[PDB]
């Protein structure tokens, strides 16, 4: 079926197989799911339906859509542009790491499976040469699994602080260059979709996830991992970090408030069904994130079983858990390098698809906002090449010895946290109060046939902005500092630059409001009347 195959190619992504188990391990195992389902009910469905309906209603780019819907709140589109730019800066480095693993994978003995190399330290141990072995005192002397040492000391060569940026890893630089040039090739030759290439490269991530889950539940000691994954602690629910990360993981994994969802709705015709597509896409995305959660947490439950250390500190708990649990799982497969290279090719494919659609949405939005310059002299591909070069040069700062901390900061503060919370707050406030929920419900009725069931309407009015403003205020008053490996206690200037770029991603709405008020002034009530009124026939 063409409908089933095309939809399944958009459910899976890196936000389900890499970011969700990271956020479910860093912010407590089972305590992460309680705000996850709450935001899935109250902010995934309503904001997803809102953005899909608005994108299909206006049927154009994602930043002029807000121009023709509500010209006062046009800064929401520019905030999504900044979020997309930050994402395209650091969404490609995961493909660089996955290429680097693919470089080392083609060997009859895996690099991350034995306890002797140029990078392994003295405190390593095989953890497989004997059943009882000689641990529980080597564990007291900080025993380390070989994959945990391999990642830290060869993949990125971690340094003891963000102030200790070491030499640039040249192999990783070549990996990033290869990722950017294959993304540019996908931009030029590869836009012509369908054929025999979609029947293979769409069900392959689900087959690989299914076989990885089937293996992961078979690993001994996975019962403790699943119990840690599911049984929650309320003391771990007391901090606002879990709530913030759950809500913005909901917003990130659904592409909500990124900016490409308004462009996705514009691709569909005016009479496409928003409600059913939104419901099934959101539910299937939550389900596949949940399944990848089972897989990674079962694997690290086995890791904690084979060590003497408990489940809470057995992996990095930074954004490399998918690069630690998954390389551990593929070692237990018979014919391990085959499954390893197929898995890393899966990661390359499902990261490249999202990067391609993100950069395509960004370039089509920036040439729609500048129509008379980039559509007359054959320079759209030149703009794409210049943007790729610029994001490669700005992206290389995270590939150094200490650049992992910079990547962690921008992952937690660019397409996450306060940026997504503020954009969703102002989006839902705009729709439910400025444009009017009755007018938008009438527009949805004209589009798809039936109005929203008024639960989504009340979510737009009082539920979603209320809960997101509550989470924002709760994060702001009970501030908890960010730690990389759960104990780092970042320097003050690192928090300064993180908050600076998080503000710069979300101060573009009040700045645009201020300059729109200043540019066209007719005193306050006439200004708000002429800015509240929508433009043309939309």
């Amino acid at each position, epitope marked *: 079926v063409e409908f089933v195959l095309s939809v399944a190619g958009e459910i899976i992504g890196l936000g389900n197989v890499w970011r969700f188990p990271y956020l479910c391990y860093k912010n407590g195992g089972g305590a992460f799911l309680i705000p996850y389902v709450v935001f899935f009910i109250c902010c995934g469905i309503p904001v997803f339906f809102l953005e899909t309906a608005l994108g299909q209603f206006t049927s154009e780019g994602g930043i002029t859509c807000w121009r023709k819907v509500c010209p006062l709140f046009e800064g929401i589109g520019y905030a999504t542009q900044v979020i997309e730019a930050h994402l395209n800066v650091y969404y490609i480095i995961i493909l660089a790491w996955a290429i680097f693993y693919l470089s080392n994978c083609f060997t009859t003995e895996l690099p991350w499976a034995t306890c002797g190399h140029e990078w392994n330290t003295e405190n390593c141990v095989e953890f497989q040469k004997l059943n009882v072995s000689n641990y529980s005192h080597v564990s007291l002397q900080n025993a380390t699994s070989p994959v945990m040492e391999f990642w830290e000391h060869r993949v990125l060569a971690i340094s003891d602080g963000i102030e200790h940026i070491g030499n640039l890893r040249w192999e990783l630089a070549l990996c990033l260059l290869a990722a950017w040039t294959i993304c540019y090739f996908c931009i030029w030759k590869g836009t012509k979709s369908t054929g025999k290439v979609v029947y293979v490269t769409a069900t392959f991530p689900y087959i690989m996830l299914l076989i990885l889950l089937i293996r992961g539940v078979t690993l001994p000691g996975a019962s403790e991992g699943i119990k840690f994954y599911l049984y929650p602690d309320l003391s771990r629910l007391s901090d606002p970090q879990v709530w913030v990360d759950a809500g913005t993981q909901i917003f990130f994994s659904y592409a909500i408030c990124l900016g490409c969802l308004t462009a996705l709705g514009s691709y569909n015709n005016y009479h496409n069904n928003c409600y059913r597509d939104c419901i099934m896409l959101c539910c299937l995305n939550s389900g596949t994130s949940f399944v990848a959660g089972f897989a990674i947490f079962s694997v690290l439950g086995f890791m904690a079983y084979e060590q003497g250390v408990p489940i809470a500190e057995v992996a990095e708990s930074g954004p490399g858990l998918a690069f630690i649990a998954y390389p551990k799982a593929v070692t237990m497969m018979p014919l391990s390098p085959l499954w390893a290279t197929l898995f890393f090719m899966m990661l390359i494919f499902l990261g490249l698809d999202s990067q391609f659609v993100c950069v395509e949405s960004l370039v089509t939005a920036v040439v729609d906002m500048y129509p008379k310059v980039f559509r007359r002299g054959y320079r759209r591909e030149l703009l794409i090449l210049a943007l790729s070069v610029i994001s490669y040069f700005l992206g290389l700062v995270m590939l150094t010895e200490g650049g992992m901390y910079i990547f962690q900061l921008f992952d937690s503060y660019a397409a996450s946290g306060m940026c997504l919370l503020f954009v969703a707050i102002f989006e839902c406030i705009c729709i439910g109060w400025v444009y009017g929920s*009755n*007018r938008f*419900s*009438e527009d949805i*009725r*004209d589009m798809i*046939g*039936f*109005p929203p069931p008024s639960l989504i309407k009340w979510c737009w009015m009082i539920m979603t902005p209320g809960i997101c403003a509550g989470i924002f205020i709760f994060f702001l008053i009970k501030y908890k500092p960010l730690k990389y490996n759960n104990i780092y206690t970042y320097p003050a200037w690192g928090y300064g630059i993180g908050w600076l770029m998080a503000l710069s991603s979300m101060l573009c709405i009040p700045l645009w409001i201020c300059i729109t008020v200043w540019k066209t002034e007719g005193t306050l009530p006439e200004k708000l009347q002429k800015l509240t009124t929508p433009s043309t026939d939309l």
Partner: antibody
Amino acid sequence: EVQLVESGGGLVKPGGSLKLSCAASGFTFSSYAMSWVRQSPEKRLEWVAEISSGGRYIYYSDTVTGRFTISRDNARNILHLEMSSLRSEDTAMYYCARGEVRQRGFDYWGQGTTLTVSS
Amino acid sequence: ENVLTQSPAIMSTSPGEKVTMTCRASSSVGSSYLHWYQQKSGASPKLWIYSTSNLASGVPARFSGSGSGTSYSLTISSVEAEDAATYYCQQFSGYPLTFGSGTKLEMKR
């Protein structure tokens, strides 16, 4: 429970005009769209006009477009249908149907006001 | 103008007998947009079957719509004296809205 009582209608000259009125009660009139469905004396049913729940999405059939206009009033819960240049072909009995969900149809219909155009 | 037609225009059924009407559409229509109405002799039509599968409030379960695409049908298990009326078929997919010619359910004795 829900009563779609209607008014207006009668005998009008050809080329004249008339103003039909639909009174809706027992439900939120501003939250459901409306339509006028006429019935020919040959018992042939056809749709005439449709106004949305807000009042800015208005559609007409190809046989009465241009000459027929449909109004609304969400305050007093009333509906209107004003026609111009009535011929002998659009004499019928007009119903006041209620259809908002397009997967539900005109679920609640009216009573019917007889309209006669003749010389 | 999705010109809907119905055959036969006139039919007569004895009570407790199999009967199946039809509504042939000129163009393709959605399976969840075609509806069926019932108008008694000298009364306003009421909603009977919506989205060609379901039944409205008060409709007995012996009515059952079927069909998809362009050919649609309305099936009745056992008719009685309480449902001798005229039935029309509508569509909301394309504008302008159209109705069927109308099948008259008659009785014989």
